[PDB]
Curated annotation (Swiss-Prot), chain A:
Keywords: Cytoplasm, Cytoskeleton, Microtubule
Gene Ontology molecular function, alphabetical: gamma-tubulin binding; microtubule binding
The protein's name in its UniProt record: Gamma-tubulin complex component 5
Organism: Homo sapiens (Human)
Family note: Belongs to the TUBGCP family.
Main location: cytoplasm
Gene encoding the protein: TUBGCP5
GO cellular component assignments: centrosome; ciliary basal body; cilium; cytosol; gamma-tubulin complex; gamma-tubulin ring complex; microtubule; spindle pole
Protein's GO biological process: cytoplasmic microtubule organization; meiotic cell cycle; microtubule nucleation; mitotic cell cycle; spindle assembly
Superkingdom in the source lineage: Eukaryota
Compartment(s) of residence: Cytoplasm, Cytoskeleton, Microtubule organizing center, Centrosome
Subunit annotation: Component of the gamma-tubulin ring complex (gTuRC) consisting of TUBGCP2, TUBGCP3, TUBGCP4, TUBGCP5 and TUBGCP6 and gamma-tubulin TUBG1 or TUBG2. TUBGCP2, TUBGCP3, TUBGCP4, TUBGCP5 and TUBGCP6 assemble in a 5:5:2:1:1 stoichiometry; each is associated with a gamma-tubulin, thereby arranging 14 gamma-tubulins in a helical manner. Gamma-tubulin at the first position is blocked by TUBGCP3 at the last position, allowing 13 protafilaments to grow into a microtubule.
Function: Component of the gamma-tubulin ring complex (gTuRC) which mediates microtubule nucleation. The gTuRC regulates the minus-end nucleation of alpha-beta tubulin heterodimers that grow into microtubule protafilaments, a critical step in centrosome duplication and spindle formation.
UniProtKB/Swiss-Prot annotation, chain B:
Keywords on record: Cytoplasm, Cytoskeleton, Disease variant, GTP-binding, Lissencephaly, Microtubule, Nucleotide-binding, Phosphoprotein
Pfam name, any one: Tubulin_C
Native source organism of the sequence: Homo sapiens (Human)
Phylogenetic lineage: Eukaryota, Metazoa, Chordata, Craniata, Vertebrata
Function: Tubulin is the major constituent of microtubules, protein filaments consisting of alpha- and beta-tubulin heterodimers. Gamma-tubulin is a key component of the gamma-tubulin ring complex (gTuRC) which mediates microtubule nucleation. The gTuRC regulates the minus-end nucleation of alpha-beta tubulin heterodimers that grow into microtubule protafilaments, a critical step in centrosome duplication and spindle formation.
Localization (cell): Cytoplasm, Cytoskeleton, Microtubule organizing center, Centrosome; Cytoplasm, Cytoskeleton, Spindle
Transmembrane segments: none
Main location class: cytoplasm
Positions carrying Phosphoserine: 102
This protein's encoding gene: TUBG1
Binding site for GTP: 113-118
Protein name per its UniProtKB record: Tubulin gamma-1 chain
Repeat is among the record's keywords: no
Disease: Cortical dysplasia, complex, with other brain malformations 4: A disorder of aberrant neuronal migration and disturbed axonal guidance. Clinical features include early-onset seizures, microcephaly, spastic tetraplegia, and various malformations of cortical development, such as agyria, posterior or frontal pachygyria, thick cortex, and subcortical band heterotopia and thin corpus callosum in some patients.
Curated annotation (Swiss-Prot), chain C:
Assembly notes: Component of the gamma-tubulin ring complex (gTuRC) consisting of TUBGCP2, TUBGCP3, TUBGCP4, TUBGCP5 and TUBGCP6 and gamma-tubulin TUBG1 or TUBG2. TUBGCP2, TUBGCP3, TUBGCP4, TUBGCP5 and TUBGCP6 assemble in a 5:5:2:1:1 stoichiometry; each is associated with a gamma-tubulin, thereby arranging 14 gamma-tubulins in a helical manner. Gamma-tubulin at the first position is blocked by TUBGCP3 at the last position, allowing 13 protafilaments to grow into a microtubule.
Tissue-level expression: Ubiquitously expressed.
Keywords per UniProt: Cytoplasm, Cytoskeleton, Intellectual disability, Microtubule, Primary microcephaly
Disease tied to this protein: Microcephaly and chorioretinopathy, autosomal recessive, 3: A disorder characterized by congenital microcephaly and chorioretinal dysplasia associated with poor vision and nystagmus. Variable ocular anomalies include microphthalmia, retinal folding, retinal detachment, optic nerve hypoplasia, absence of retinal vessels, round areas of chorioretinal atrophy, and attenuated electroretinogram. Most patients have mild developmental delay and mild learning difficulties.
Molecular-function GO terms, alphabetical: gamma-tubulin binding; structural constituent of cytoskeleton
GO cellular component, one term: gamma-tubulin ring complex
Compartments (UniProt record): Cytoplasm, Cytoskeleton, Microtubule organizing center, Centrosome
Protein name, UniProt field: Gamma-tubulin complex component 4
Major localisation: cytoplasm
Domain of life from the UniProt record: Eukaryota
From Swiss-Prot, chain D:
Organism of derivation: Homo sapiens
Name of this protein: Tubulin gamma-1 chain
PROSITE patterns the UniProt entry points to: TUBULIN
PTM entry text: Phosphorylation at Ser-102 by BRSK1 regulates centrosome duplication, possibly by mediating relocation of gamma-tubulin and its associated proteins from the cytoplasm to the centrosome.
Family: Belongs to the tubulin family.
Top-level taxon of the source organism: Eukaryota
Gene: TUBG1
SUPFAM superfamilies reported for this sequence: Tubulin C-terminal domain-like, Tubulin nucleotide-binding domain-like
GO annotations of cellular component type: apical part of cell; cell leading edge; centriole; centrosome; ciliary basal body; condensed nuclear chromosome; cytoplasm; cytoplasmic microtubule
Keyword Translocase among record annotations: no
Subcellular location: Cytoplasm, Cytoskeleton, Microtubule organizing center, Centrosome; Cytoplasm, Cytoskeleton, Spindle
Length: 218, 369, 369, 370
């Protein structure tokens, strides 16, 4: 009965589909306003460097599935995703003088390739499999397991749990190049850094656990 | 964030109307601009339903169609007539631009082959004047004609934010090969398909590419090289599509290398096999890129209109487009020494020479400087 | 069923009637207790075939050797929906439930605001003094004279409004109140409790309507005094203190005429009676919250703007020449307090305060403070 | 609180009748001034039904219309006549004031270009301030020897009329060609009546605020000098749709610069919940510039269209760009001064209007105060 009323509506399944939809269109206009703060200003915008804790309201019949420690993980991936949309949009909204453009394609590519990896290859691969799994739910318990086997794996493929200061920080520090170069609109001293950190990125990720090779091409 | 369309001359009004036919056919909107009962965000291309169309002899033909509920030959001739009605047409733009909540772009359907080429030349210089934060993309169509053509190039070389070539000769080839016709009313059937499928990611929201600036700026490396060519083979896995796309028999253009490739997949394909298809494209190496900048191929998934089978579209930035210019360029030098100031024509010839000379250097290992 | 209670020892759990919880049974839910009190009050205030059938059902329950709560509600919910359906007829169709609600929104929620500005103009001097035992009737003739003063004439629904003065258990406005004698069928929905929270809102809304009026009179006093260097300091503070109240008096049509638009929708959609009893109870609960009344800080900050403005408008009206004999020495005292309160509320703002701050800062002036 | 309306000059008497035939049509009033069968508060303009009008050759044209039961060219010449019929007309005005319960204002329709208006309209404004000192005098004046009549009148409207709305015939004749395609006076007046009608919409229907003429003007005029307004009528559909067409100067009848305060009037049945959503996007786009010195806001109000007769819209604007129109006029005045009993009154009038144009040009500075 609970699963029945959860496809729509105590439609627990219907509520779950909306959850991973209102983040991970609509959320495009939301972030673009933040590019150009206040805690009440955002709410009217939503209802229309690393913070913005987001939450939601779940009825008791589905409270047992979407637990409290489940909100934070869903919030964890949302924070990191925006920083990618940020750098991707920051280097996109604009349009040795022309030498800067060679530093654009050499960079606007790299952030774009990463974004193509997290969303499509991960945030849509496991998502396509998860839906095909929940539609065969036959138990109160295993529905938790098939769900908990969706976050704890998507938090691993998207490298955020461990090996942060070993690998994740590299992507994080080169993301600061997407901020510095965006404002300025020293040039020679950027490629010396860029060609180093990018080579630092590949010469560190070269240890590849196996799914990392889908991006290791560039 | 909406995009407004403008149809100029007999050609532009023809290609836009048929495009508005199929687009209204894809959407669940009856010909009478009334919603049909029978998921799609349509505020970008529709106003609550009336399209944001700006049409500019053929007007009678449009009205005679059952879709009435949905609303000389010199280049210098068009340029003069445009200044005459400067405020006449721009009030229609301004009443809709300010009438639009947040305008995003400016798409243009015009043929540079007579008056639309002159009027189109007028709009570009004018649109850059008033609106400095508005994208201008032009779906220009290519084939006394060399003159009108080369001028529109000079205007299009620095005014438009992007450009998509559509040459009639290559389109004439597809007319006989895979259709067996020999007609104007038939070649545009493909052009509408090219146009509609081009903006599918914007009318059906997905995860990536929720704005037109998101699609183009991945291709264009520098504002000078803002010329694109398209591809549409389906007339089957993800690998079968892209390989059918790189064959020059399908490209709508009559050493060299690419700049960047963007692909559109509209079928029910699985996202499990796309990243591997790129590998087999790289290993087998069916295309080369610039030797200087590390170039990439992009591909996006979408959803076909349920109100309407795996199809796909390809957008390209290929340096072989230089040859198309050099032909009319040679044709200009032909009639120049063959036959009140006649000085602007030389200024246009100088600037278009720059762009071509940049193409030939764009494909060299020393594009720097 | 008959609107009277048979009790003389405080036995029944219903003692303008109310409801008792500390004596209510255990297994009976509080929800159905709300249903009972409504059907009874609606008949008492009200003073064919729907009578005998309800009797036999009540008697049949006594023969069941097991009180099943699932069946106790099964008969009460029909009776509630029965008297509510007929009352909704009388409230809308003959009386233009909906008709009574329109009358409520008019007089309780200051819907007919034009009546209350002339009511203030007349009943002004007879209320500024401390209220006594005679001013209770001294004003009722003024209010009755007010309705006839704007050619609103109806012997119906006029004698149902009798202004009360909470005397002997201070200005007159601090004790003003308005009671409404509910009819019989609507007594189930209008208990003295729900008519009490309505009364509290009527005091706060009448207060701000009073200060804006006398403030606008000051505006007409400066304009009247067109031909002192310090004379400009008034309007530089008056127009300043005008926007803090006028915009405070906006957002009220955007919270009244909006919430009222939903409650009027909730009835015309659901056929159930329980929906009305919860939607209306939900409708009123928003007025206590959205109108910033329950939140003490916003209620304690703008509260000072009210009586501070009284001194200002009185001071400028208490003289006919320039503020010379310590008057300018007095004006400089309020600005030292008011201008701080302006930035103070700016810090309180920075759920619904955006709808208030958007109007206050669309001109980006408070950003400088 | 009623408003007695006066109409002077040919243009003023013509627009009023078209304003009257429009108003009585919105209500269920027969041309015979009798209610027809077929909530709308009708006391503000009608006396118990007769309109509180005082009309001052063209009168014959009005009495020949089926609405009969509804009731030289030099500045010096017009004034001289005024003082000669001084006592005659005031008994007409005074008796209407005592007849009303609590008279509040004085609506006046006159044209500065119109000789009679430049002579008789100017004289009343000085007498009206003398006799009744506590009554606002607001005029629906309309700009067009021609510059003389204009500047001499502006000398009175800047110190007597505590409010004013300007209607420029140049922009009106323009709007007639582009979106109406007329080429006469009899056609352009149709749109004039639409402005005055929707200008007083909130007063004729019971609302929450804006229940008096003071309820509209006081938010617009901060200082006794800045007392000039402008109007805009868009429909010639959501709440966000109507506002984006207001701020476009393509519809405002006008020919740094920034506003002072905006009043929006909506006559449709739009959902009043999304109006706060519309304002947010407007502040985001930043479509209009404002003053930094003092606190100001953009306002909006709702009402109901006449049922006996879809969304319309009218905006009240207080712009400093209106000063340019004055300069154009006063420029031509100086042009005729150097080309052609005391010739001194026309001299001081040029000086006092210099203060007005100065006040607006100094208003767009961060230091307008003092
Ligand atoms: N491919 C294609 N080309 C067209 C079509 N209609 C017109 N053209 C081209 O447009 C050119 C003539 O444009 P024209 O009618 O003179 O434009 P106008 O001067 O603005 O009216 C010709 O060279 C045609 O090749 C069409 O339906 N399809
Ligand atoms: N808007 C408008 N203006 C008018 C109308 N009739 C006259 N005017 C204005 O009045 C001016 C001419 O004044 P005139 O009527 O000769 O003055 P009179 O001789 O004293 O009546 C012109 O500049 C017009 O702009 C009208 O019906 N509508």
């Amino acid at each position: 009965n609970l699963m029945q009323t959860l496809k729509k509506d105590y439609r627990l399944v219907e509520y779950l589909q909306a959850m991973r939809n209102f983040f991970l269109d609509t959320m495009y206009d939301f972030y673009t306003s933040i590019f150009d703060q206040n805690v009440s200003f955002l709410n009217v915008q939503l209802q229309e460097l690393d913070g913005l804790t987001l939450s939601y309201k779940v009825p008791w019949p589905v409270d047992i599935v979407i637990s409290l420690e489940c909100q934070k993980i869903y919030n964890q991936v949302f924070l990191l995703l925006l920083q990618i949309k940020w750098a991707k949009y920051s280097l996109d909204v604009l349009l040795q003088i022309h030498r800067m453009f060679l530093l654009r394609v050499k960079l606007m590519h790299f952030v774009n390739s990463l974004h193509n990896y997290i969303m499509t290859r991960i945030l849509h691969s496991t998502g396509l499999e998860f839906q095909h799994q929940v539609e065969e739910a036959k138990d109160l318990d295993q529905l938790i397991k098939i769900h908990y086997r969706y976050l704890s794996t998507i938090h691993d493929r998207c490298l955020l749990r461990e090996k942060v200061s070993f690998v994740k920080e590299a992507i994080m520090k080169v993301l600061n190049l997407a901020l510095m170069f965006a404002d300025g609109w020293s040039i020679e001293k950027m490629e010396s850094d860029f060609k180093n950190c990018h080579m630092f990125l590949v010469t560190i990720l070269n240890k590849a656990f196996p799914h990392l090779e889908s991006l290791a091409l560039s | 964030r909406e995009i407004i369309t403008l149809q100029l001359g007999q050609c532009g009004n023809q290609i836009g109307f048929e495009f508005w036919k199929q687009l209204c056919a894809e959407h669940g909107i009856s010909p009478e601009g009334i919603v049909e009962e029978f998921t799609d965000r349509k505020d970008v291309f529709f106003y609550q339903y009336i399209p944001r169309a700006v049409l500019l002899r053929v007007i009678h033909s449009i009205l005679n169609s059952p879709y009435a509920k949905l609303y000389g030959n010199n280049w210098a001739s068009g340029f003069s007539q445009g200044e005459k009605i400067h405020e006449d047409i721009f009030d229609i733009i301004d009443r809709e631009a300010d009438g639009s909540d947040s305008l995003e772009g400016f798409v243009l359907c015009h043929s540079i082959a007579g008056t639309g080429s002159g009027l189109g030349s007028y709009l570009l210089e004018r649109l850059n004047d008033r609106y400095p934060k508005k994208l201008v993309q032009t779906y220009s169509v290519f084939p006394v004609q060399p003159y009108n053509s080369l001028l529109t190039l000079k205007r299009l070389t620095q005014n438009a934010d992007c450009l998509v070539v559509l040459d009639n000769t290559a389109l004439n080839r597809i007319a006989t090969d895979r259709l067996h016709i020999q007609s104007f009313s038939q070649i545009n059937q493909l052009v509408s398909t090219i146009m509609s499928a081009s903006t599918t990611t914007l009318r059906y929201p997905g995860y990536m590419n929720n704005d037109l600036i998101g699609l183009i700026a991945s291709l264009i490396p520098t504002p000078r090289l803002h010329f694109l060519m398209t591809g549409y083979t389906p007339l089957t896995t993800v690998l079968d599509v892209m390989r059918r796309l790189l064959q020059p028999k399908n490209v709508m253009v009559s050493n060299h290398c690419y700049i960047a490739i963007l692909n559109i997949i509209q079928g029910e394909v699985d996202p499990t096999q796309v990243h591997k298809s790129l590998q087999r494209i790289r290993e087998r190496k069916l295309a080369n890129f610039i030797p200087w900048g590390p170039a990439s191929i992009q591909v996006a998934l979408s959803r076909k209109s349920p109100y309407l089978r795996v199809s796909g579209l390809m957008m390209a930035n290929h340096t072989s487009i230089s040859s198309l210019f050099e032909r009319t360029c040679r044709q200009y030098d032909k009639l120049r020494k063959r036959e009140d100031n006649f000085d602007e024509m030389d200024t246009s010839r100088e600037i278009v020479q720059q762009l071509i000379d940049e193409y030939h250097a764009a494909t060299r290992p020393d594009y720097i400087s | 069923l008959h609107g009277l209670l048979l009790d003389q020892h405080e036995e029944f759990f219903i003692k303008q009637f109310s409801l008792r919880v500390e004596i209510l049974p255990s297994y009976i839910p509080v929800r159905v207790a709300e249903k009972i009190l409504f059907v009874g009050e609606s008949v008492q205030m009200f003073e064919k075939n729907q009578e005998d059938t309800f009797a036999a059902e009540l008697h049949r329950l006594k023969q069941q050797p097991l009180f099943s709560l699932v069946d106790f509600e099964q008969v009460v919910d029909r009776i509630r929906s029965t008297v509510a359906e007929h009352l909704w007829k009388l409230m809308v169709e003959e009386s233009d439930l909906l008709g009574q609600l329109k009358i409520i929104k008019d007089f309780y929620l200051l819907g007919r605001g034009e009546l209350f500005q002339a009511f203030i103009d007349t009943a002004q001097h007879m209320l500024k003094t401390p209220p006594t035992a005679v001013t209770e009737h001294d004003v009722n003739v003024a209010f009755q004279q007010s309705a006839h003063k704007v050619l609103l004439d109806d012997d119906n629904l006029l004698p149902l409004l009798h202004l009360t003065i909470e005397y002997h258990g201070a200005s007159g406005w601090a004790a003003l109140g308005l009671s409404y004698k509910v009819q019989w069928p609507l007594h189930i929905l209008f208990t003295p409790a729900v008519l009490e929270k309505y009364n509290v809102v009527f005091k706060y809304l009448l207060s701000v309507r009073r200060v804006q009026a006398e403030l606008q009179h000051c505006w007409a006093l400066q304009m009247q005094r067109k031909h002192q260097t310090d004379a400009i300091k008034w309007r530089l503070r008056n127009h300043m203190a005008f926007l803090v109240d006028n915009l405070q008096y906006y957002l009220q049509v955007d919270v009244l005429e909006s919430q009222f638009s939903q409650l009027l929708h909730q009835i015309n959609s659901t056929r159930d009676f329980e929906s009305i009893r919860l939607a209306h109870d939900h409708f009123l609960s928003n007025l206590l919250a959205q109108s910033f009344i329950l939140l003490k800080p916003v209620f304690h900050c703008l509260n000072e703007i009210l009586d501070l403005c009284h001194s200002f408008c009185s001071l400028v009206s208490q003289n006919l020449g320039p503020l010379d004999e310590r008057g300018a020495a007095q004006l400089s005292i309020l600005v030292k307090g008011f201008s701080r309160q302006s930035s103070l509320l700016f810090k309180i703002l920075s759920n619904s305060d955006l709808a208030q701050l958007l109007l206050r800062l669309d001109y980006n002036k408070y950003y400088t403070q």
